[PDB]
Design a protein around this ligand. Structure first.
Ligand code: ZN
Length: 52
């Protein structure tokens, strides 16, 4: 699985780390994150993300 980054702020979603505080377990491929999840830094939607 690949890392994704927020086009707005530069946050990196690392699938090996997930975002567990917001319910995204380690091992979650970006496509599988629930589509109401937002960037934990700037609040951007998934649609603003891209592969590193
Ligand atoms: Zn962001």
């Amino acid at each position: 699985m690949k890392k994704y980054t927020c086009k707005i702020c530069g946050y990196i979603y690392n699938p090996e780390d997930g975002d567990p505080d917001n319910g995204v377990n380690p091992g979650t491929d970006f496509k599988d994150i629930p589509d109401d999840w937002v960037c934990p830094i700037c609040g951007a939607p998934k649609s603003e993300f891209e592969e590193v």
